[PDB]
Design a protein around this ligand. Structure first.
Ligand SMILES: [Cl-]
Ligand SMILES: [Cl-]
Ligand SMILES: [Cl-]
Ligand code: NA
Length: 129
């Protein structure tokens, strides 16, 4: 599923991401835009053989099991394929663990390089929240 901007914002707010660990909603929408272009089916291979999955491009090296990243962890205790669902519950729940691990949203390279320090509130402007 390819979300609309305000559709995704509403879904993330319902699942408790607004101001989660101090990150306002616009941060999460900005991150999803540049990680996946709001596409729940996005996948990208990393040079170490791990793969990033879903709307927030969560990495199989640490966070999910895809059966083909030897020596990796599964800290969210999910198959990586669950992160590609049109329902973003699994992605949000796993993102909550990632952002809680000490590095904040710096875990998402696109957030650090394209959202951090910008007017992220613009990503939820015009949305009925
Ligand atoms: Cl915001
Ligand atoms: Cl594996
Ligand atoms: Cl933080
Ligand atoms: Na894994």
């Amino acid at each position: 599923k390819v979300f609309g901007r305000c559709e995704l914002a509403a879904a993330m707010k319902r699942h408790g991401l607004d101001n989660y660990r101090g990150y306002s909603l616009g941060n999460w929408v900005c991150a999803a835009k540049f990680e996946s272009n709001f596409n729940t089916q996005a996948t990208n291979r990393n040079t170490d053989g791990s793969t990033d999955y879903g709307i927030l491009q969560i990495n199989s090296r640490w966070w999910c099991n895809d059966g083909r990243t030897p020596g990796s962890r599964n800290l969210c205790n999910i198959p990586c394929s669950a992160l590609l669902s049109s329902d973003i519950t699994a992605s949000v729940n796993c993102a909550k663990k990632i952002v809680s691990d000490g590095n904040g949203m710096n875990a998402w390279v696109a957030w650090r390089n394209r959202c951090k320090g910008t007017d992220v509130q613009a990503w939820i402007r015009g949305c009925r929240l």
